[PDB]
Design a binder for this molecule. Structure first.
Ligand SMILES: *C(=O)/C=C/c1ccc(O)cc1
Length: 100
């Protein structure tokens, strides 16, 4: 499948969410955009190795990291590879997701 892609602001609010990501997770993009990724849609990502690294990277202005993660919240459990990095646009961060 095509990468899943999510664009977040620095607080973790979902600004963009593509169809491929919804195919991985079962989420309808229009129902999650505008909600908080870490505190509402994806609470299983509220961990030091995901959310904690996100916040560090937002703070430092240097976010660019890759890691494996399990997406198992209100979906058939799926191992994924995550790449999060700062965007070019203002107050924007990308999360790219591939099944592994
Ligand atoms: C854990 O709560 C993960 C949930 C999640 C991951 C990625 C998404 O796009 C949606 C939900």
């Amino acid at each position: 499948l095509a990468f899943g892609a999510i664009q977040l602001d620095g607080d973790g609010n979902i600004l963009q969410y593509n169809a491929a990501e919804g195919d991985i997770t079962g989420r309808d993009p229009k129902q999650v955009i505008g909600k908080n990724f870490f505190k509402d849609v994806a609470p299983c990502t509220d961990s030091p190795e995901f959310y904690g690294k996100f916040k560090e990277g937002v703070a430092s202005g240097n976010l660019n990291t890759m890691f494996e993660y399990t997406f198992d919240y209100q979906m058939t459990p799926t191992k994924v590879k995550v790449h999060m990095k700062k965007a070019l646009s203002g107050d924007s961060y990308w999360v790219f997701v591939k099944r592994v």
